Symmetry: C5
């Protein structure tokens, strides 16, 4: 089987369509997601054209081996997709209507900078390498691009499944390659975060601020240091939820800031005690009294500054 | 092999049945469960009809390659099922009786809101795509829908295995599809949780309440803060058992409330000390005395409120 | 290939035998184990009978495709076994000596109630579905049921590999099914437990009992609460070894009891302090003095009760 | 199919080229990385030569089964690559132009001594075993050696993808083997480290140094020991990020040094207290006063020494 | 294809050779290791002999399907090896020279008693089952037994790759089987251990010994108990490195001893305080003074006894 010949010198148009059946296994660390979808393909092969009246049939059904089918691959997959041809149908003019059900693990980069208020665009790149006899170009049949209503991705709101109609045609290793960008838009379900992550983390930090209404150095050391341990322990507890990024994230910055605050609170506690011990309790008391306002205010201000920088 | 032709214009009825052999690997995080079962299929193909008299046989046995078999797939599977044809049997009228043993990893969403007193409905969706020559419709042979008595799912009580008789017929990618909902009802085995999770978690919270029979600020800071660490550590210890939900769960609400109580207990401890230090021990003593009743009562009340809201 | 025909109306006997080559991956949580073994099958097919004198051969060797072989499956496997036919041999009478090497992941429930002094019976259920032409029944050739001496399962003592000779013949989906129970008996290697789990866990509890020879409420709060943290931390450390059971285990009950003891020790510590503070040190001292004997005695008593209930 | 025969006694030159499509799953522990790339092969097999005039085509396309293709393997792969032949193109001289898309898990050792400021050279070794009829030698077509601009490896900066043109020809098991070294140069994205790992780890160590402005042995024991716990807990928190090396890493030497500092700080705290208790507070005060400068200075010096030794 | 016939009644000798290409994934817990190697096989089949003069060629190349090849399997593999036939070569006398490249996950037990100063012998057991027509016996061609110099196993020093020349012949399931033991000797790279595991673990224990230069019961309780927590936390931190053995290991014994020492140190701390409180400070002081020497001495001694006991 050879490709259909051009009437003039025109490229072959392969009309594509992806319909999402199942969407699962979004791995935040691996930046991969698993997909189970239909891949629809369409092209004209005049060599397959028939007279419906003499044939008695409106449509002819073929086996994949029997006819020429374009070699469509995905760019951003781990291994080649597991595909099962559902149907091949030929109409009198030689139009081929191909359909297969496939499962694939797709590599799509994720941006955690706005976590947990982040939205993501998942990419599925379709590609075709042109042959010596003729050039092959990809196209999008928007009527054949969809997703099952039941498609769920735990922790995310599935916004849209679309395709960038204009293919990316380019040369690679002395041949033409026509690329298609299919986009799955998702946004994170940030509710649970507040009572599960933020709130208990703020309570632990607020407990260390009680050292500003105490003069007992022993009680203060216990308050600041024991809360620091509790904070680390709490982080270990929530660790699963927070992401491992090589860059600086919003939640990541807040966490860093909380660590800085434990350090500054220690300095205060240490300073207050040294002044008291070095017989200047008026200064010690003024610093502690100031800290009572300074700490929440500077925290609230710095949080506003961060939120602004990230959004 | 082409599909059997219609006598008039009627669709082909494929009588289905699923008999559960093994049920295992219910992954609470992935919302997947592995199944090992029999899939029974039955349809009429008159091209296979024979006279039992001139043949001498009551039944004819065929190889899957030899005859036409409908392309039945599952909707909510990760990859296509691993199937092995057990038997194909044609009765004289041309009625085919297909049987295969298959294993599949099924995606079924789970609702953790009532954990660990939650019940779940696991779905197995059967599907058939209609062809150009004829429409195919799925049906349920209730005598062929069952489950092995030995079917076990560690941590769950297997209630029922049933099917929604009326198929969901709809159009997809320009062709008809007939869908069947098979339901596996399971309810959780919540015993262990009381002595394993709830009770030790209540003991740690009760230890913090002893700060209401103490005046030593140092001892009180140690009681409240060290129990807070112990609580977090205990949560890390039970972490495996509790589920990672993007929404608010019953167990998760209790946990949040316990965090709030540690914060309020700190406020009390802090207030009691400030009043004492600021020379008003009568108020400090009244607050501590009240807390002794207030804390258990408010706890018991808010737990009743929560239980009521969730159940 | 069709099944061998019956002389009268008798069922076909398939003589089975499993010889364990390798045993590995016993997953305590999944209740699965991986197996690599030989499966031997034997039956008489008179159509295959030959004259050794004219043939010059004592035995004829066939390819699996060439002759009829019974469809033997395992009930409690995840997916169908990976089998490789080692040999097929026919003797002049038509006796078939089949042999294959297979690997499979077996689902066998485990009972953790007596952990770490538990023994288990692993099941491998062989099955054959009868055909329309004749009934098939399984049998056990005990000379062909064994296990390699080198078979090891880390942490267990491999007791025996046997089969329940009497098959379980029953009806399923309108046909006869003959089932065989192969049993692998294993018992746990509980040595390490004592120095690794029990002993350090008892030492931490005993440290908390030193609060009965102290009057310092601050030192006592530190002893009881810090040991409670240490206990939880130790549990997190050993967590890998202990099992996640939905029911009550022996080891599990001891752990619960240890949590109760930390709570009672807190009550004592709290009571002793309140009496002292409320100017009744004679009562406080009597309670503490009693606790010194009460705590070890009640602990020892309850453990005896627990051991008795579980064994 | 046998190899093409030599015109004289010359070896067959196979011109190779690898073009990186996707780069993912760099496992720091396993020292493996997953790759999805094009493998281009080119050789002359005159047996395939054709007259374009008689054939009516300028280039002939073949199926892999139809012609002889060299047995190219990778040395450092886990299992054999998953390859899919994209195109086989024969020009009239008999020049074959092969192309396949493959995915493979490549084993390449990593050097963590300079982590997180480490750079790595990933190797992909191409190999061909010579046959009895003629010798096969590998070559590099540099125009066919590249990488997609979109190639990303989370946490790394992809420097270059090159090949050592000169093959490593050697004898193995009585036959010639021609080896090619393809090199992927990567350098780590160390930003996040500072606010994520170092900074909070330095703050915890600095908190322990406050014991040099305190005389309370109880407060000092709490400062040193509680910070030590906090440090260990923090290490458990960052454990995922730091690597498990059998040798000494730069980050690892810093961590070891931090442990030594907690030990020396304990000695000081212990010494200061013993001198005070043994009625020599002048010495105790001088040691503590010195420590205030000694500890940061010695730390800063030893970190400079470490950095120097590693870089 | 049948096996080559014997000239007299002699068995067929299959000359084997394994050449290690890659060695990876040594799983200390699973006691498995992955291996990528060449398997060379050689035997004489006179039915494949040819007159070099009449034939024209000295070596006849065959496809695996074309000739008889002995069924060689590995005993201690999880599933059957992934093999790819590299070459089949028949000399004029009928001497077959087989070569395949295979990858397999091999089960080999490990002995952790001397960890981290352990050495291991990894086994790869080759096996052949004899047939009805002829007995098959394995042999070792030592010139074909080797390993690539680049073979690395992170954390281990690869000592040797050898084979026990004398096969283990025995009967199994009524037939003869010839077994070959190939041995890979490895020894652990124990450097990192000292600064990573031992040293920080000794520092934490030494901190607890400072309680012997203190009289403050509160400071002592804090020293002993807080270090005990730190020790457990440190163990959780290093847990990945240490192995899960059902038997007593050297490291495991040291760890147990360290737990005993924390318990004895508590007793001392408790005793010292009781004597002081019960008005006998002379005894309390003598015990504490003795402990200062007793604890390090008894520790150092018990370690020599342990070291000797294990080596
Ligand atoms: Cl693909
Ligand atoms: Cl399916
Ligand atoms: Cl099976
Ligand atoms: Cl390869
Ligand atoms: Cl094998």
């Amino acid at each position: 089987v050879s490709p259909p010949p051009p009437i003039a010198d025109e490229p072959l148009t392969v009309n594509t369509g992806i319909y999402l059946i199942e969407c699962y296994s979004l791995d935040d660390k691996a930046e991969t997601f698993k997909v189970n979808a239909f891949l629809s393909l369409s092209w004209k092969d005049r060599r397959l054209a028939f007279d419906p009246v003499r044939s008695g049939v409106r449509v002819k059904t073929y086996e994949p081996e029997a006819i020429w089918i374009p070699e469509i691959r995905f760019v951003n997959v781990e291994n080649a997709r597991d595909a099962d041809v559902v149907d091949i149908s030929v109409s009198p003019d030689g139009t081929v209507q191909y359909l297969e059900r496939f499962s694939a693990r797709v590599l799509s980069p994720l941006d955690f900078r706005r976590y947990p208020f982040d939205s993501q665009t998942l990419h599925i790149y379709l590609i075709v390498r042109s042959v010596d006899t003729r050039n092959i170009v990809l196209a999008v049949d928007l009527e054949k691009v969809g997703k099952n209503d039941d498609v769920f991705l735990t922790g995310w709101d599935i916004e849209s499944f679309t395709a960038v109609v204009k293919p990316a045609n380019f040369a690679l290793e002395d041949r033409l390659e026509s690329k298609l960008d299919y986009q799955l838009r998702i946004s994170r379900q940030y509710f649970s975060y507040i009572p599960n992550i933020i709130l208990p983390m703020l309570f632990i930090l607020f407990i260390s601020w009680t050292a500003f209404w105490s003069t007992s150095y022993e009680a203060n050391v216990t308050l600041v240091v024991s809360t620091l341990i509790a904070f680390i322990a709490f982080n270990i507890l929530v660790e699963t939820n927070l992401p491992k990024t090589p860059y600086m994230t919003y939640t990541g910055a807040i966490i860093f800031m909380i660590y800085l605050f434990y350090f500054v609170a220690v300095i205060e506690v240490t300073v207050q005690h040294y002044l008291k011990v070095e017989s200047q309790p008026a200064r010690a008391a003024s610093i502690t009294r100031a800290s009572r306002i300074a700490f929440p205010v500077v925290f609230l201000l710095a949080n506003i500054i961060l939120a602004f920088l990230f959004f």
